[PDB]
Design an enzyme around this catalytic site. Structure first.
Site, PDB file in Angstrom:
ATOM      1  N   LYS A  59      25.316  -0.141 -35.022  1.00 55.75           N
ATOM      2  CA  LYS A  59      24.398   0.640 -35.863  1.00 55.75           C
ATOM      3  C   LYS A  59      25.051   1.043 -37.184  1.00 55.75           C
ATOM      4  O   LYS A  59      25.028   2.219 -37.576  1.00 55.75           O
ATOM      5  CB  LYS A  59      23.896   1.903 -35.133  1.00 55.75           C
ATOM      6  N   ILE A  60      25.642   0.061 -37.865  1.00 53.99           N
ATOM      7  CA  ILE A  60      26.519   0.353 -38.992  1.00 53.99           C
ATOM      8  C   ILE A  60      25.743   1.110 -40.068  1.00 53.99           C
ATOM      9  O   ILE A  60      24.686   0.666 -40.493  1.00 53.99           O
ATOM     10  CB  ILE A  60      27.193  -0.926 -39.546  1.00 53.99           C
TER      11      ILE A  60
END
Lengths: 209, 201
Positions: A59-60
């Protein structure tokens, strides 16, 4: 060529490896997240990559430089792809998507989370995310199977981008989503089963992929 | 007193400890992110926490259950606080702040990233994020120091929540986060004294 992708969200790396081996006939890719990676070490991705291609669902969601480093670490540990949040903007999308290509890998941009909170801010910009991700050169998208009308809109906007959809499995949202999705992501329905191999096999038949 | 926080943005765990030992006495807390934690292992937070309290800047951004697991691991490894994205929704904010209660920890919600990309989607909902974080029972916020009018608005909406920012911002901020500038000099003591003076309003 539609895929069943296992979100292998167990926190014991040895258990994760055992499950991965068991489902190899029926699952196309394995997706890992931070609870597993922090518990077992990032090297668990290299181990899993010897069984299936590995999607690093991190979930950068940082500024371009930090986001770049996280992606790079994922690919240095044999991930085939990473997941980035589109909401944080085009600079981070361009940077992470370019880094991925430098490793021969792929990036999937999150349009909106499948949780209720996803409706608060993400839903309103989901279609704009699709265009930013396309323009940034990103390969694919993560989109809910829960919101079918929205998934249809995303597919229309995405053109031929790859779309992966989280789904409970053996549930109508997942079955309907198959028409629009390139892969269906299933987690605990498979990995928490007493017989993960059998459950994976069943789900392929149920999803008709 | 406003705080000085060291962003320890290296990837080598032994280098991070060496820096922390040299700079320790001059800062209030240490902030770590994923490049360090993934490279060195999450145990690096435990070792750093024995020097100064550690903020786990994990930009937590998942569904509530998974987000809570991440927060839990951070607190299990001695983090005093975690940073979470409010953009992903109030349910994640609530569950992460719920977890923090168990550990006596703090949660800081990101209003908008300081990068240009933060202006594309986050800026439009920044103030609404403050409201959600406040109503979720979260302790504080992360907000840009480079957007002064927005920072003013954020402080207004935040009430007495703790705001941390990565001189014009000082009146609104409860702490400033600084990285390489502190220690890459020949002299962290001197750099820290200048920064403390900036913070002394």
């Amino acid at each position: 060529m539609k895929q069943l992708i296992l979100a292998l969200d167990v926190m014991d790396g040895e258990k994760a490896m055992e499950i991965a081996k068991k489902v190899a006939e029926h699952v196309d890719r394995i997706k890992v997240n931070y609870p597993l990676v922090l518990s077992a070490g990032v090297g668990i991705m290299k181990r899993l990559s010897e069984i299936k291609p590995v999607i690093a669902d991190f979930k950068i969601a940082d500024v371009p430089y930090t986001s770049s480093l996280i992606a790079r670490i994922a690919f240095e540990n044999s991930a085939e792809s990473v997941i980035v949040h589109g909401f944080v903007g085009s600079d981070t999308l361009r940077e992470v998507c370019r880094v991925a290509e430098e490793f021969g890998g792929k990036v999937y941009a999150v349009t909106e989370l499948s949780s209720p909170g996803g409706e608060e801010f993400m839903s309103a910009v989901s279609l704009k995310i699709v265009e930013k991700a396309k323009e940034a050169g990103c390969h694919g998208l993560i989109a809910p199977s829960t919101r079918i009308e929205r998934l249809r809109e995303i597919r229309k906007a995405a053109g031929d981008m790859e779309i992966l959809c989280p789904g409970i499995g053996a549930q109508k949202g997942s079955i309907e989503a198959v028409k629009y999705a390139d892969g269906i992501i299933v987690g605990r329905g498979i990995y928490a089963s007493g017989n993960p191999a059998e459950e994976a096999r069943k789900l392929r038949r149920v999803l008709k992929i």
